[model samples]
Target: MPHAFKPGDLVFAKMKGYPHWPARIDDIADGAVKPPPNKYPIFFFGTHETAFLGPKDLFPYDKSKDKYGKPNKRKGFNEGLWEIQNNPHASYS
Candidate 1:
């Protein structure tokens, strides 16, 4: 089994500068976890007031924390929570 997500899995979690947002998961990290055995990099979408932001951030685990030390939810497609699956192959306008 791949420890990472495949091409069509939904990822939900928190990224820096945005909170309580939702994201449809995208491509996996592909071996970039530093000390080898790379972890999954969560690709998500969020809204920063005026824009629907899409950025690749770290995954939120059990012990993750934000910069403010306010218990980081991290980032990933929210399983059993809620998500939006858009066309992955669509071009960005």
Candidate 2:
């Protein structure tokens, strides 16, 4: 889905399977923008804390629960990025 956020806007991304581990929106891909050439476009939002990215289906983070209505355990960090990104089944909000 198209993101409701724009460049510079603070947004949150839900890991494919994990609803509680939300990814922070560091940058918005304006089409003209590109990754580091070797890196892949994991999500529409550019690299924030790590080299990981996910789908563009993002939501406005209220600093509360995630899409699954579960508390975000990461608390706004990419600590869960690699783990969940590597194993989508590990997602559990």
Candidate 3:
């Protein structure tokens, strides 16, 4: 069978410490290893967080994200802003 959601699909992600909330799928991953690895990289609304999550942790939202008062939008951000926004994957070496 094929996946239920694809990149740019909006969904209600069941992330920890929050009720089912809105998210936009930005990317997907598939691994062919023994145990199998699949995940979704989603961008969160309201909180503006991002993480690699699994299909089991996500489900279709089927509603407009703007219904949540338009939340926050990451638009017109300078390419220079990425480093600080993503924080360069954490630095503690």
Candidate 4:
């Protein structure tokens, strides 16, 4: 089965290669973007551009910052940038 999400709902997104993380429903765009159809709708979480990527492309949404004192750009769907692919979601852990 698939999950339905609304704005402000606390949810979890996963990435196969990186550590699992949490994400919140920042916004919802139904049929907004033309590509990367998703079941969770279009959620805008995290603190960067990659955060808006499709759910499958979402690696993990972590609140902690990296050593750079900046947000960790999971680099969703963007090449050369660290991103989560394949199995993008996992049970909340």
Task: State each model's CA lDDT, in order.
Answer: 0.36, 0.40, 0.53, 0.38
| Quality of model 4 by C-alpha lDDT | 0.38
Model 2 pairs in collision: none
Backbone clash pairs for candidate 3 read none
lDDT of predicted model 2: 0.40
lDDT agreement of model 3 with the native: 0.53
Tens digits of lDDT, candidate 3, 9-87: 6676776765555666764336622222577676665456677788887766544333432323334123213422344
Model 2 per-residue lDDT tens digits across residues 1-93: 544444333335555564434344344336646656333333321223433443344554454334433434544344444433343333223
TM-score to native of every candidate shown? 0.31, 0.33, 0.51, 0.33
What does candidate 3 score in Cα RMSD to the true structure?
9.0
Off by over 4 Å in 2: 1-4, 28-56, 63-93
Candidate ranking (lDDT, best to worst)? 3, 2, 4, 1
Least accurate 10 contiguous residues by lDDT in model 2: 38-47
Worst 10-residue lDDT window, candidate 3: 76-85
Q: Per model, how many backbone clashes are there?
A: 8, 0, 0, 1
Model 2 TM-score is: 0.33
Q: Which regions of candidate 3 fall more than 4 Å away from where they truly are?
A: 1-3, 28-36, 63-93
Candidate 4 C-alpha lDDT tens digits along 13-91: 4545743344444443475544345544323233233344355543323323232123345643232122222222322
